[PDB]
Design a binder for this molecule. Structure first.
Ligand SMILES: COc1ccc(-c2ccn(CCC(=O)N3CCOCC3)n2)cc1OC1CCCC1
Ligand SMILES: COc1ccc(-c2ccn(CCC(=O)N3CCOCC3)n2)cc1OC1CCCC1
Ligand SMILES: [Mg+2]
Ligand SMILES: [Mg+2]
Ligand SMILES: [Mg+2]
Ligand SMILES: [Mg+2]
Ligand SMILES: [Mg+2]
Ligand SMILES: [Zn+2]
Ligand SMILES: [Zn+2]
Lengths: 322, 331
């Protein structure tokens, strides 16, 4: 396990092995490792036992019976964000508090996920959709639950931050997790594209982000990229993620069919095209986003983009075409 | 007769004759109805607009829902109570009938605006969003510091539909329920003052490019146009106190100050900074009302008056007279 954690600063860490080796505690192990690596416990005077207590409770609140949106996905997004934070184009740009916010946001961003979509929750008149007025239903809930867990016994990892730091961190984390709602994707992308075209860099080629709006925008898209990073990973990892999302989707589709509902796109196990669906996912969502991130940090993300394009060509390879 | 049983009734009927008028004496209605102004006024309006027949709402279902809704406005909150809800409902009802908007809205849009008005402050605790945020309340935790109370009012207002014999929308189609739900959410979220400046700016833009028939009736083109007018309409109703007959306005001022001072007392007790205009020891009630009109209420109503010109001219005139009252009573 210690050997596998040597790759914690590398894209494509084998998170599934981490999960197996840690007794299904990938989120706790990876968060702890990253907090030590970034010296965050010292910087913010976080008691190690408080950190571990919070992380284990947090991890407990990801559902074991949800195939994709579980603690392994959370650990993956945390670790991917951790790698992106260290991209050369962003060297010394973000404060320790901003870094803490991005990583914490990643860790909680899907907590207590039920394995069905916002639209399903809206369409089925769920209590969650009633609570949140059909608006970013799950993302609001992830935030509420993630913060609420800080209240459990010896779980307040932010106990030694100043009031101002707490308030700032809370705002940033909320802004980041709400940006993981796919209903915001096109607007986020449109604005990121415009940021890229007017971007400013130092002599060494480091990005200049002069206000909160530009800074939080980059953190939002960073964690969104991490959330949408599966197709950019080594193929053996990507195939496992594809298996899991389809299992989750098909279970939702089964519930829709039981309820006499129209079956959502890609949720029908009898009429599904896995390869077609991943190529569409890459072409219409993942590549447009990642090519824009790559533009922002050029050339830092070229290897990531190369893998994505290779994986796209792979998934397309068994689909007959004119 | 009037859906609550009162003593008297004939006197209540005389007051309800003004349900179509600005400056209905809603405090009188509240007293005459045994503190059921929201139930009585909503009942009257639904009957007047024939909404029970249109949407096949059983009258007993309507009264049951209204009574339940009214019960969830706090009796010990001086301003944000069932009288305020009744007032905003009745004010929206008048604004909907303004000549410039004749035949513009569907019955479902009318139902949405009235329903939104009725629930728009339900279960209000008598403290602000910012107070709830500053004190780390469960509500602010639930709603991530964003439109905290307004999200709550919606959730409660909708949830009460699920109580026994309370679903006034049971005979709407699936599509109608979905449309009404979206409109009601859009309207109540627009009552968040954090959205006021943007909302007014966009209303100004709409006024600059407004289209009218030769009889000065507004032409709205799409959902965006219609919901924008409905959002500003209910926001105007929410902010209509200073445009009312002075005796009504004077009572609303007394009540909001009572509520604000109570929040300031909670702040002082916890050693927090006391919020603007919430410090009973250092208040200028009259000066604050003039400020309120100059910076919030007049800019809004002047723009609404433009939109429906000349429908709201008298409302505007009353506002200016009332500003002068509070000006004239600054110590
Ligand atoms: C490996 O496969 C995927 C991995 C991740 C996603 C995916 C889509 C959107 N996100 C972002 C988070 C989100 O908001 N979601 C989660 C999915 O459901 C909708 C709300 N993530 C999709 C994947 O593929 C789907 C299965 C058929 C092709 C599409
Ligand atoms: C008659 O007096 C008032 C009547 C209504 C308001 C008022 C302000 C904003 N709204 C819109 C609803 C809202 O969002 N609120 C409610 C008040 O607290 C802020 C969140 N309503 C203010 C009044 O005066 C205050 C006392 C000092 C001057 C201001
Ligand atoms: Mg999510
Ligand atoms: Mg492309
Ligand atoms: Mg190289
Ligand atoms: Mg309100
Ligand atoms: Mg138009
Ligand atoms: Zn996710
Ligand atoms: Zn109100």
């Amino acid at each position: 396990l210690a050997k596998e954690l040597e790759d914690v600063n590398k894209w494509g860490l084998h998170v599934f092995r981490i999960a197996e080796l840690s007794g299904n505690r990938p989120l706790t192990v990876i968060m702890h490792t990253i907090f030590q690596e970034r010296d965050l416990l010292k910087t913010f005077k976080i008691p190690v036992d408080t950190l571990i207590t919070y992380l284990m409770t947090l991890e407990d609140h990801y559902h074991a019976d949800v195939a994709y949106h579980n603690n392994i996905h959370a650990a993956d997004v945390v670790q991917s964000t951790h790698v992106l934070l260290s991209t050369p184009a962003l060297e010394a740009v973000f404060t320790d508090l901003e870094i803490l916010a991005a990583i914490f946001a990643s860790a909680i961003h899907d907590v207590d996920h039920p394995g069905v979509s916002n639209q399903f929750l809206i369409n089925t008149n769920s209590e969650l959709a009633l609570m949140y007025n059909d608006s970013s239903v799950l993302e609001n809930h992830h935030l509420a639950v993630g913060f609420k867990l800080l209240q459990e016994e010896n779980c307040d990892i932010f106990q030694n931050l100043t009031k101002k730091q707490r308030q700032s961190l809370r705002k940033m984390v909320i802004d980041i997790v709400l940006a993981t709602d796919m209903s915001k994707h096109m607007n986020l992308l449109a604005d990121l594209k415009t940021m890229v075209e007017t971007k400013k860099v130092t002599s060494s080629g480091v990005l200049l982000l002069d206000n909160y709006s530009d800074r939080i925008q980059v953190l939002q898209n960073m964690v969104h990229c991490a959330d949408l990073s599966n197709p950019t990973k080594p193929l053996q990892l990507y195939r496992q993620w594809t298996d899991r999302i389809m299992e989750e989707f098909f279970r939702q589709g089964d519930r829709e069919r039981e309820r006499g509902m129209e079956i959502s796109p890609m949720c029908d196990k009898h009429n599904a095209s896995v390869e077609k669906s991943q190529v569409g996912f890459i072409d219409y969502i993942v590549h447009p986003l990642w090519e824009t991130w790559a533009d922002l940090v050029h050339p830092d993300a070229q290897d990531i983009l190369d893998t994505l394009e290779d994986n796209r060509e792979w998934y397309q390879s068994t689909i007959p075409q004119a």
